[model samples]
Target: YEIQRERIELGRCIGEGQFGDVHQGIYMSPENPAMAVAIKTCKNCTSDSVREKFLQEALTMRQFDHPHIVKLIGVITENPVWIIMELCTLGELRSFLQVRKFSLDLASLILYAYQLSTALAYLESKRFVHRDIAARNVLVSATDCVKLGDFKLPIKWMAPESINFRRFTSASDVWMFGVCMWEILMHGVKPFQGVKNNDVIGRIENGERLPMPPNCPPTLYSLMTKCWAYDPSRRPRFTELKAQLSTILEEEKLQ
Candidate 1:
């Protein structure tokens, strides 16, 4: 089959990373005038690993049918692969939190946390671990709905206590989720802000944890601590976290 070449009218640059630049593009189909989509352009693609990573990400995204997870529209590979994904106009969660000064009201925070937990729960059900569950990977829609994106890193290990301690599992995802919670409360601040990545890794390896944000609710702080536990087995699962977050939401509604 011949490859369909749709003319993409480029818009503002959305994001840039080691992979390449991601731009807001208008995908014009014969039937549609211009559909907004995120187009990721990679440079000098020679490694077969790049293709493998693309396929893995596509497959993982295809398996999820959640509203909070970004949708994959299509892929272009006439030359280097250009991934066409749903446009998240609101951009990264970190940017959003930064503008808000990391001081989100309880109701808004609970709402976002609930949305993230829901996405994680769905991912867990699919047996996929989102190894990197940080705020930057979480995207928001124009309607203020949160959607999880970027799945290049696969879960390699389950909870820190499994016999196969090197396998990705739901518990491992929970641990990352705890870190994500910290990021959200800290306005997308890097964990151990002034510390180096190596030092953070060493601390984690030594059973140390990222500090809690100020003024976080007691219950939420306790949950975050449990998620960041050195022994992943001690971390709460997504279901448990979801339940607790839901209860908090319910109680907050009463106030």
Candidate 2:
């Protein structure tokens, strides 16, 4: 979607990334003024090549259409390009889950894991790989809806192939998804906690995998191990994982 710069009144800066800063904003839409939005403005993206790649990424990212994924409202190119998205009130999933009152049961855990898998499954259908899958990149709404946000990054969250060969594919995302599961179970604990970046890669290269986090279901934990399989082809597809999560959800309901 294309949005007019004048229509969006940027507000306080909510977060800042390497190339951009996200601001909470109000969109004075011709259709509706009550549109709350988040504006991610490119900071020092002056080079023509950088601008082109950035806008193209946002444009392609907009092709995603799933309730489980964060919605891209529009993209505006007014000097520094702005990528707008739906403002999720509850903030990052890590912080949301960290809230004492928001402790999750098996049902809620499955719901979130299911939604994330569904979102990734949709992305995989589109042939897009999300290299970053962590609690911090997921956004939650006031209604506790989980929406996958912020495309993958951070060395620790990367898969073995991604780290070693810089190869990114759905299989790499499956690896990252396993890390996401661990993140949720550990309530935001960093992956490979206390391990250096090189050692993290070394461990993966040596076929060492993370241990099961506390409170993770036996079935779900087994699924995570599948995701961490050494061979990329050995990892289950996101669609398969979604089905597994759905089955788990149903199993929980039947009890």
Candidate 3:
């Protein structure tokens, strides 16, 4: 198979992780002057496995025809697998949180959160789990639409002792969503910042929890707390979370 490698001008690198780096790039196609896209290049991964994973993600993304999930456009695999995806001009939720340096109104916050919950609800309906739910993975389009991106770690943090854990569960996704919410409100402050990784893990294992963000609404606080419940069974489902967020947003509008 021949791979079409487009000449894309690399922009600033947006995200970095153990896997590789994600950068913003401009693709100049004959039909269009230039279009922005997120390009991901995996490091230390075999060409074949990277291509396979890219294909898997592309296939999975195609299955979810939703506005709140990022769209995968094309892939280049001559060497390192290059994944071309929709460019979120507004950037990651984490960048917005940190750079804006202000808290989002209850309604606005719930609006974005509800969109994500709706997306996750759809994914759950298809028996898929988004293990890594963080502010950095949520992107806002130029029109301000929120979408969930990044499917690198789609596994459950824990499983039922009796079930012998096969795949990620909806409850685990909910727990991750709560952490995402916390990051959103905290201006991209990581959970347990200034603490060692082991300490953070220990606290989570011991039933200790992340604190509520300052100025968070009472209802929102309650919802987040429910999401961070120690037991997966105790975590609220996406349906319940959506309803709760909708109600809160509606009430905030009325006020």
Candidate 4:
């Protein structure tokens, strides 16, 4: 959605990153009237190519309308382009899990996993792969609902093939989603703990996967194994994964 630059009134900075700062703003459009929004401004993106890349991401996010995915309100691209989005009050899921001393119950685990899978399924339907699918990139709303956010990523989250050939695909995303699952089950602990970064590639090649975290369900461990299969094609699609997660949610409902 394209928005008039003048209508956005920026306020306090709510978030910051390598790209830019995301500020809380009010859109004073006559039609939509006053509305609260997160304005992600990139002042350093002065080059046309970088600016266009930012706009492309804005347009890509606009196509997604699922509840589990964060909403991109619109973009203002004149100068210091702002990527507007609906704000999540609860913040990142990684930090949320960090403060909780107790392990997440079956219900909470199923809820978050299902939401993430559903969002990824939506992206898959649109042929968009979220290269990054970690706990830190997923945001929890005030209602305690999980929403996928900050689709960008790093090599640590990459699938084997992504690193081997530099090709990223939906199956690649699935591989990372499994790591994300591990992060959730283990309560935000970093993946590949104690393994040196250089040796990770060789370890993975030799079929070494993270050990099942204490208290993790066997069923979830099985799913994680399937996701990290050596062959990318063997990885489950987001829709199938979501359905699998739904099984847990459905089972827990009877409790």
Candidate 5:
């Protein structure tokens, strides 16, 4: 949906993205109450190609309606283009987990992964490929709510096929989701912390995988391994992942 520029009141720059600066803002619309929002500004929109790419992000979000996916508020396609999105008050998932490492329990970590599985399932059903699926691309709406956020070609989180070729599909997303789950269970510790990107590819090709996080459930780790299967076809579908994650979350909750 198109939003009038006058309706948005910009605030401080909250983040700097590859395309432009992300700002926290207040959106005042006649149909709804004044609400807090995140504005994705498009810098250097002088070129038509750049303008189209910026607008495409809004268009892609407009088609998605999953609860765990970030909603597109509207787009301001004028000279200074802006994509308005619902604010995830708590910010990025990685930072959130890092800051509250001790406070959050195992069940909480599993719950976040389960929530994302549902969103991924929804995207799969819609025939959408989320090329990027890492904790860094997730946002914390609340302590209990995590939403799929923004987008990247992140070498470490990528699947084997994605690394070798340019092939990307829902299955590739599953692989990245495995890495993302590890990040959450590890309290936001990065996968292969000091390993070089090319080295990571070599290890994967050699049938090596990230070590199981300390104290990680064996069953949960098994699921992560399934995601990292060499053959994409061997990887579980998002629907199956959602079901399995739900069971895992319930089991953790009862502990």
Candidate 6:
């Protein structure tokens, strides 16, 4: 939907993206008053191709209506183009987990991964490849709800095929999701820390996966490994990941 610039008031800068900065803001509409929102700005709106790619992100979000995926509130197609997205008040999942490291329980961590898998599975059903799956790209909508955020396609979060061959598939997304899961269990610590990007492929080739996080359930780690299967075809589908994660969450909850 098209939104007028006069009705939206920009607030603090929440994040920086490849194209521009994302801001936490307020939107005023007759239907909703002073609603919190995230405004994604386009720094190079002057370039035709850049502007098209920026707006394409909005078009992509417009096609999906999922609770675990960030919703496109509206867009400003004028000179200073902006994509208005629903604000995840708690902000990025990585920072959230890092700050609340000791406060959150294991069940909470499993819950975040399960919520993400739901979003990923939804995208898979639509034949959409996220191309970016990491704790940094996930937002904490609430203590219990995590929504997928758009990112710049980072190498550390990419699949081997994506890094080496420019091939992207839902399977690659799954691979990244596994790393994301590891990050969560590690309390937001990054995967392959201190490992050079050029050497990640070799490490994977040598069958050296990320070591299990301290006290991470072995069952959960096993599922994460399934996602990291070297052969893309051997990786589990998002649908399967979602179901297994749900079971894992349920088991944790019962403890």
Q: Model-by-model lDDT, in order?
A: 0.72, 0.81, 0.72, 0.80, 0.90, 0.90
Clashing residue pairs for model 2: 132-152
Evaluated at residue 167, the lDDT of candidate 1 is: 58
**Model 4 over residues 84-163: C-alpha lDDT tens digits?**
88877766687777766375576786688888998899889989877777887887785349898775335556688987
Q: What stretches of model 2 exceed 4 Å from their correct place?
A: 100-102
Candidate 3 lowest-lDDT run of ten: 154-163
- Backbone clash pairs in model 2 (N, Cα, C under 3 Å; residues 3+ apart or in different chains), count: 1
**Structure candidate 4, residue pairs in collision:** none
Taking the tens digit of each residue's C-alpha lDDT, what string does model 6 give over 16-47?
76689989999999889999999999988989
Per-candidate TM-score against the hidden true structure: 0.86, 0.90, 0.82, 0.89, 0.96, 0.96
Model 1 agreement with the true structure over 1-255: per-residue lDDT tens digits:
122455666678898744778889898866577888887767755567776666567667767788899988777766666777889888878888788773567667667888899989888787776766778788878434788978732222123443234555677778778878877767667666566433445556677766668756777878888887776577788889989998877777677
Worst 10 residues of 6 by lDDT: 150-159
Q: Which of candidates 1 and 5 is the stronger one according to lDDT?
A: 5
For every model shown, the clashing-pair count is 6, 1, 0, 0, 0, 0
lDDT of 5 at 242: 89
Candidate 6 residue-wise lDDT at 131: 84
Which ten contiguous residues of candidate 5 have the minimum total lDDT? 148-157
Q: Which segments of candidate 3 are over 4 A away from where they belong?
A: 1-3, 7-12, 28-33, 45-51, 152-167
Candidate 2 lDDT score at position 11 = 94
Number of colliding residue pairs in model 1: 6
Candidate 4 whole-model C-alpha lDDT, 0 to 1: 0.80
| C-alpha lDDT of residue 41 in model 4 | 78
